[PDB]
Design a binder for this molecule. Structure first.
Ligand code: GTP
Ligand code: GDP
Ligand code: GDP
Ligand code: MG
Lengths: 49, 430, 442, 269, 150, 430
């Protein structure tokens, strides 16, 4: 009885953990893309000036 | 009018988890099991699928059986898993090995008595019992052998009720298991004697639904099991909600089955359309009927254009006019008159229910009895005869204990079923 | 649930070192048997149980025996780094070798040692509650591996009966060779193995050398490289018992799908993403590419060409990030190909398995890190060519009784040579008859 | 990003944006992983708020109606509760409790003492000027601060049986918090540290810093905290149970080890 | 065969398991606004036969076929909601308004002393956030009172 | 109406300690003896088992007897031990030696007078005395021999009261003692003439209750003694609380003992269910009655299906309708009519009590007089004849002083009672 409950609890925690990590990875990728675009625009303006 | 569910094997338990999620959502049952709905219309027929435990809570009248507990541990670990009664999970200690004879004769008889005890407790607890409903695959091991064993026992104990099955059958293009023809042949032999009505689904047809209609880039088995859970929960909708023209499993059976062997049906569910396109087209009865007869939306590999309809049934959910339903069914029968068997004057039954599935204005599920189902059985019989002439892999089955005469009986019974469909396809008034 | 591994002789113990290295690193057991706690998840997991059992103090010990007649290699295991992992009773060693004589292992020397091995295996099987087979690793080229492996398989087959026995066997390579008497020992081993094994997996060192030269960039490979590849193959096949997946595959499913008749149990094995770290980041590795790879003969771990025969059954194990729809599309494309042929009595030729755990990377290893892999074991009539060439070499030596006095002195009747040769002749005719197509009517 | 527009890019872009809108807008209850992770973070932030504990009294005695902490002699941790590890039982709501290290007073580890109205039928009553002082052998309640939740909780226990066991080891009685109170199952009695002078110090006032043993009045089983460790949202915490811990299992009645001893912690002067 | 040394290397030896996210059912079937689906729980018979003389409105056929809402009758749902509010799952919290004659849950000394000294500002400060503490009723005392009756 | 308890031997003292814990809990008595209850209904019948000592205190009306003080010193040193009156602990200086003859004839007569003095003081102190209650095992040494000695003295001195025993009987699968058949046969011989009603429990049946019904992984004697204390305190519950249909030990005996020699009964208690499942199923009279007659829930190795019920009794606790009880007992008697003795028109007595055990909505305790008890005695007689034919251990008993004629008398007397059950089992209406 204890073994089955332990298995079920581990499965639910690990599934929640995987979902959260996937969402954070996607958000970080988007943020890096936006930062790259912004810094390149700033560099172009500075060079022209 | 209470239904008892049986879930067998991995596929059955997986489809069942999504089905019981959909049903619990429609009746406003929280995943903790507490009733939280907001209209009496939800509560007043909850008994059909749920039994009432004390202080609010409801528990679902279903038996889960499998030979290795891995799937059951996954469903208990799922988001709605807590709702299921702990005592309803029955398991052994070793797998079916994809062998029909093991599942039917050796590991079967040890558990079957405990399964019958649970099924009898559930049936005898009902104040009035409606038919049983079973979902399983025919290609597997425990699904085919133990499902047909249990079906035979329940048909012995309750011969006056209805027996309904939803069944998964091997795709025509790719096999998942080498010994599929034996398990399929023996299971179809058992079903045609024992069952009253059987619905068949091909996984290849669900993949074609997902890719062509919904345009999903990377579909998964969760999507296929949602489509199946949607149609299965739709066929029973008139039992449990009010409507302008009520219907019942026995009334579907009386209108669909002309002769007792002709009980194999095609399935479809109409409102399918991709998220980008859906903003561009409103729901209406002509659109649902047009999608309903397109072979793209039918969940089996045989296509209606190579056969003829003996009978069909359509169940509509939502607030709609009866005139549009009646005139659509008349127009389809008149314009395509060559595809309907002529010695029956009207082939379509309609039924109308007031309450649609959540988030749809209207929906229909379609059940069709069409002779083109004979092509799948013919293919299975050819592959079986190819395998059997060389007695391929036969020692497994004979070592478990089967007589070779069962294989020749099952082959003969399927050949007679194919012949009977072909003769009624080509019948004439004269 | 549980499985017990039996390692015999020199090759089997050395391959065992690589296997248990891998199983430790994949589950996370430290070399001294401990396992560090996790702080992100609240409780630990049962996955070790297939290969490890825990003591009441939480130390892990593995479900294996190591059997040898010479002490030196087992003493090397005893004095190495994994000293504290194994139970000392599990490492069983005699005093002196079987000297490349099958007769010395089977009749003279193994008869004394065999009862200790059976007592240890019995003591293991008593500490189980869902044992589902024996895995056996040995080489048929040497004396003790052949003779004691056969004697022990016979005894196991009498005592345990129906329980399954799956063998990984190192056969004499078709032109690389190490000892003169290899054909006699391999023939006599194969005679016993015919009656008392359920599936036999075939390996040739020349194929793994070819694979490590062509795909990896290693000019001077050694046995540790081959053993790491073998360990990866065994881990891929046993992963279906140990980790979550879409389509699991129990060890009994192999026997049901691959063996049509009880003698026709010898299978070919291959593995797809053998690739180096520098090559791996220049290329995608999609499902269809690795599926196309497993059918080329350059991917095989046995030196045979399957284009000269017909397939009877294939079992495909996918592990990692794979979606079933891509597996179905790949298998349908393979089925379309004209250079892949199945016997006409086996129309539904394929079994699939899909597991989510990608293959593990070993610190000293030479394989790249990859998100997905596929492994195949398949039964094909092409295997008949390996026996015919061993049998011809046996016939060449036996025509002159080239070495027989050793075998007769160590306890064997001369008749046993002729009996075994007739049994292998019947096995050759079985592969001739089973492979004949009756597709033409009249 | 956008990637190259070959294949099914249009429908998948639409699908991704609709999924993003659904996840950002809807609540979805406990199905959403991000929302429940955020609410667990807010849970942990709320439970660890500081509390203004009371200073020691001038007389140096143990007093009622004053915030306090409970520390164990073996674990050196403080008694704490988790409001969300709760299950409904036939006898009511059970809320799990443990002992954990902490950086100071908090809403999860500050309690008050409330006296019980009935003594053990041979009590010598205290004088009217010692009403607020806690004496040995006098039952009292342990209760949570009013700022934690609407309904006050109490420390309870139940007899051991087939359906009752401890949280982790399962070999002793169970201790849990419950809104049940003013009942026979919520009374506790303190005794003296030295075994030989235990019955000489009965019905006498308790010093502010005494080491003492807390007993369940209705079962006569001392309170204890073992070294068993379990994880929860706060980290690793120990187990709390009622039972007698002895050196020799062959003599269950005998000397008690350090994990049956407790203490009361005040604020620093 | 030199063994591993640190726990970090042993941890990074395993790659994390891949995870396939099943598509949400709202992404497959929903046709209205995905963030606010309309609620359709009305029957034609209830919406047709009204009490026009009493005061409730009448509906045209287009109104019958195209109206969103929930049926007015909710007696059994109200009773169930009240029962679960007494039990403890009820969001409206129908209980805690009054206590039974012989089902006390807190000693009166706790209410008189150390119960009237609550700081409202501190409570408001600690409650501020996306988490609110639950209210747990004293069901045990209630059912104990019910048990000892004839 | 007060009962006096006697606890004898290791088993008796251990079961008694848990019983007095359960009773002190049910009436809200602190282990110091102080009343801490919350309703007058608890207090108003406390006299039945407790005497009142001065200024508040209550003392439990029990005598503890054993031949070596180890158990008695452990219970006196235990957590509830203080409640017991010091003068009530009686012990000797040398053991029973696990021998019935030693326990009955040599060390027995030395203590028996001091035990009778304490029992008489307790009986003569009552204002009106109800029956005696005795707990002992039959397989032991001092329990069987000295218990039956004391029973004989009390039956000579108080022949008009009731004598009730709860008794532990050897398991069919594993022995705890080699000489069990002699001690059992001689004790059953003594009880057949002396006792009014005797209840028998097998430890194997309690293990099967724990493992199958409650699914405990690692049960201990605390669980077995809790099950026993629950049933023992349940049979007397109607004596000490109000109800719609009162019952009494004498009324139970008159309605269950048809002929005089037949006074051995089996026991069961119904609402056994595991802690995980209990949230899923509410209590009702059909569920309790169905579990109550299920042999799965019965505390003896003999199964009712091999015999017939001559009489039975059910004691219900809770506020419930009499109609449901009456119609359930009629429905069970009608559906299983072959298992009920024909000469009696109604075999089941019912009784209803208002106050359930804490934390249960409803409960029933079942007492049954079945003829399948004859199978246990026949087996004991076979094992006895096997040992006696070979004089297997007889020198111990003859050295204590027994004439061999006692063994043949005891064998003959028991063989008669088994035959009497055989005759009444197969009797006909004629
Ligand atoms: N792949 C691989 N092959 C090996 C390994 N060790 C030995 N072999 C091969 O197996 C054959 C030799 O068999 P052995 O294991 O040395 O024979 P043995 O069991 O020790 O028998 P005895 O010599 O009588 O003690 C040769 O073909 C070797 O090339 C190994 O670690 N890996
Ligand atoms: N549609 C659908 N098919 C499934 C699912 N799970 C397994 N299958 C199919 O069912 C067959 C495998 O049968 P299985 O359930 O494992 O048989 P069992 O071992 O006896 O339980 C294969 O064709 C799978 O593709 C599922 O969730 N949905
Ligand atoms: N159910 C139960 N059985 C017991 C207990 N103690 C002993 N027994 C059983 O009673 C028998 C031993 O009898 P015992 O009491 O030792 O006889 P004595 O020596 O005369 O006191 C064995 O069958 C034991 O299993 C107990 O606490 N509970
Ligand atoms: Mg060697």
């Amino acid at each position: 009885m204890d073994a089955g409950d332990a298995r079920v609890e581990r499965l639910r925690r690990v599934n929640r953990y995987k979902a959260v990590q996937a969402e954070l990875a996607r958000e970080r990728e988007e943020a890096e893309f936006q930062a790259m675009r912004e810094r390149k625009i700033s560099a172009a303006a500075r060079d022209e000036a | 009018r209470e239904i008892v569910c049986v879930q067998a094997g991995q596929c059955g338990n997986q489809i069942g988890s999504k089905f019981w999620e959909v049903i619990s959502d429609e009746h406003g049952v929280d995943p903790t099991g507490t009733y939280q709905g907001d209209s009496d219309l939800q509560l007043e027929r909850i008994n059909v699928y749920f039994d009432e435990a004390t202080g609010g809570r409801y528990v679902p009248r279903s038996v889960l059986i499998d030979l290795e507990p891995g799937t059951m541990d996954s469903v208990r670990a799922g988001p709605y898993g807590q709702i299921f009664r702990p005592d309803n999970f029955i398991f052994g200690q070793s797998g079916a090995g994809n062998n029909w004879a093991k599942g039917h004769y050796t590991e079967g008889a040890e558990l079957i008595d405990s399964v019958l005890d649970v099924c009898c407790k559930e049936a005898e607890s009902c104040d009035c019992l409606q038919g049983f409903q079973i979902c399983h695959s025919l290609g597997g091991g425990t699904g085919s052998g133990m499902g047909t064993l249990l079906i035979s026992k329940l048909r012995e104990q309750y011969p006056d009720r209805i027996m309904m099955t939803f069944s998964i059958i091997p795709s025509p293009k790719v096999s998942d298991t080498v010994v599929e023809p034996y398990n399929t042949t023996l299971s179809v032999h058992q079903l045609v004697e024992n069952s009253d009505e059987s619905m068949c689904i091909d996984n290849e047809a669900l993949y074609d639904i997902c890719f062509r209609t919904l345009k999903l880039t990377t579909p998964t088995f969760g999507d296929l099991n949602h489509l199946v859970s949607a149609v299965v929960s739709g066929v029973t909708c008139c039992l449990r909600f009010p409507g302008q023209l009520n219907s019942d499993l026995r009334k579907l059976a009386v209108n669909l089955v002309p002769f007792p062997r002709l009980h194999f049906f095609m399935m479809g569910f109409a409102p399918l359309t991709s998220r980008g396109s859906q903003q561009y087209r409103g729901l209406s009865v002509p659109e649902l009927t047009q999608q309903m007869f397109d072979a793209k939306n039918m969940m089996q590999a045989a296509d209606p254009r190579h056969g003829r309809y003996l009978t069909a049934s359509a169940l509509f959910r939502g607030r709609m006019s009866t005139k549009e339903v009646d005139e659509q069914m008349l127009n389809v029968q008149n314009k395509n008159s060559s595809y309907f068997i002529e010695w029956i004057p009207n082939n379509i039954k309609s039924s109308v229910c007031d309450i649609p599935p959540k988030g749809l204005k209207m929906a229909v599920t379609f059940i069709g009895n069409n002779t083109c189902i004979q092509e799948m059985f013919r293919r299975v019989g050819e592959q079986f005869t190819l395998m059997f002439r060389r007695k391929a892999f036969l020692h497994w089955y004979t070592g478990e204990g089967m007589d070779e005469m069962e294989f020749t009986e099952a082959e003969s019974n399927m050949n007679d079923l194919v012949s009977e469909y072909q003769q009624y396809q080509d019948a004439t008034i004269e | 649930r549980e499985a017990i591994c039996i390692h015999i002789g020199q090759a089997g113990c050395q391959v065992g070192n690589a296997c248990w290295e891998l199983f430790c690193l994949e589950h996370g057991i430290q070399p001294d048997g401990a396992m560090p706690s996790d702080k992100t998840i609240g409780v630990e997991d049962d996955a070790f149980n297939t290969f490890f059992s825990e003591t009441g103090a939480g130390k892990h010990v593995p479900r294996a025996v190591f059997l040898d007649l010479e002490p030196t290699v087992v003493d090397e295991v005893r004095t190495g780094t994994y000293r504290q992992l194994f139970h000392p009773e599990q490492l069983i060693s005699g005093k002196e070798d079987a000297a490349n004589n099958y007769a010395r292992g089977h009749y003279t020397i193994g008869k004394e040692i065999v009862d200790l091995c059976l007592d240890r295996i019995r003591k293991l099987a008593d500490n189980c509650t869902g044992l589902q087979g024996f895995l056996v690793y040995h080489a048929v080229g040497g004396g003790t591996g052949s003779g004691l492996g056969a004697l022990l398989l016979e005894r196991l087959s009498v005592d345990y009966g129906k329980k399954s026995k799956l063998g990984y066997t190192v056969y004499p390579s078709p032109q690389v060779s190490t000892a003169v008497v290899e054909p006699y020992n391999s023939v006599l081993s194969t005679h016993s193995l015919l009656e008392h094994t359920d599936v036999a997996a075939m390996l040739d060192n020349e194929a793994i050398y070819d694979l490590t030269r062509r795909n990896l960039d290693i000019e001077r490979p050694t046995y540790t490289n081959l053993n790491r590849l073998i360990g990866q193959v065994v881990s891929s096949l046993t992963a279906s018992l140990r980790f979550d997946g879409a389509l699991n595959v129990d060890l009994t499913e192999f026997q049901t799908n691959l063996v049509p008749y009880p003698r026709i149990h010898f299978v070919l094995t291959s593995y797809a993403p053998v690739i180096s770290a520098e090559k791996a980041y220049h290329e995608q590795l999609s499902v269809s590419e690795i599926s196309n790879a497993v059918f080329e003969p350059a991917s095989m771990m046995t030196k045979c060409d399957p284009r000269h025969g017909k397939y009877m059954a294939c079992c495909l194990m996918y592990r990692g990030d794979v979606v079933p729809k891509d597996v179905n599309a790949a298998v349908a494309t393979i089925k379309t190909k004209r250079t892949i042929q199945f016997v006409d009595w086996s129309p539904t030729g394929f079994k699939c398995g899909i597991n989510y755990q990608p293959p593990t990377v070993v610190p000293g290893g030479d394989l790249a890190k990859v998100q997905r892999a596929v492994c195949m074991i398949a039964n094909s009539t092409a295997i008949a060519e390996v026996f015919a060439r061993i049998d011809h070499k046996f016939d060449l030596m036996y025509s002159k009784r080239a070495f027989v006095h050793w075998y007769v002195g160590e306890g064997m009747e001369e008749g046993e040579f002729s009996e075994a040769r007739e049994d292998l002749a019947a096995l050759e005719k079985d592969y001739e008859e089973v492979g004949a197509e009756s597709a033409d009517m009249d | 990003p956008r990637k190259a527009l070959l294949g099914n890019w249009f429908e998948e872009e639409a699908y991704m944006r609709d999924r993003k809108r659904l996840l950002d807008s809807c609540d979805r209850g406990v199905v959403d992983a991000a929302r429940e992770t955020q609410r667990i973070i807010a849970k942990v932030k709320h439970h660890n708020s500081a509390y203004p504990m009371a200073e020691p009294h001038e007389d140096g005695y143990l007093h009622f109606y004053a915030p306090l902490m409970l520390q164990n002699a073996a674990t050196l941790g403080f008694l704490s509760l988790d409001l969300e590890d709760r299950t409904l039982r036939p006898t009511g709501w059970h809320v799990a409790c443990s002992t954990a290290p902490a950086a100071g007073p908090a809403l999860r580890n500050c309690f008050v003492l409330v006296p019980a109205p009935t003594g053990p039928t041979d009590m010598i009553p205290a004088p009217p000027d010692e009403q607020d002082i806690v004496h040995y052998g006098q039952p009292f309640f342990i209760m949570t601060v009013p700022e934690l939740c609407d309904n006050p909780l109490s420390l309870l226990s139940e007899p051991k049986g087939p359906l009752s066991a401890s949280k982790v080891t399962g070999k002793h009685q169970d201790v849990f918090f419950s809104p049940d109170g003013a009942s026979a199952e919520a009374m506790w009695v303190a005794d003296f540290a030295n075994p030989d002078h235990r019955e000489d110090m009965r019905d006498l006032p308790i010093k502010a810093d005494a080491v003492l043993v807390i007993r369940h009045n209705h079962t006569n089983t001392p309170l204890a905290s073992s070294k068993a460790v379990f994880f929860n949202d706060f980290g690793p915490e120990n187990e709390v149970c009622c039972g007698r811990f002895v050196n020799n299992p062959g003599t269950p009645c005998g000397p008690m080890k350090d994990e049956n001893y407790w203490t009361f912690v005040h604020s620093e002067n | 065969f030199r063994g591993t040394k640190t726990d970090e290397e042993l941890a990074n030896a395993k790659p994390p398991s891949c995870f396939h996210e099943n598509a949400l059912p709202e992404l497959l079937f929903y046709h209205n606004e995905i963030t606010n689906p309309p609620k359709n729980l009305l029957t034609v018979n209830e919406l047709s036969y009204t009490n026009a003389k009493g005061g409730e409105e009448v509906n045209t056929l287009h109104d019958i076929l195209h109206k969103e809402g929930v049926s007015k009758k909710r007696d059994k749902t109200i009773a169930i909601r009240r029962e679960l509010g007494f039990i403890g799952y009820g969001a409206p919290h129908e209980g805690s308004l009054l206590a039974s004659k012989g089902a006390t849950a807190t000693p009166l000394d706790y209410t008189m002393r150390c119960g009237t000294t609550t700081d409202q500002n501190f409570l408001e400060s600690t409650r501020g956030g996306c988490y609110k503490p639950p209210v747990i009723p004293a069901i045990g005392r209630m059912q104990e009172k019910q048990r000892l009756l004839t």
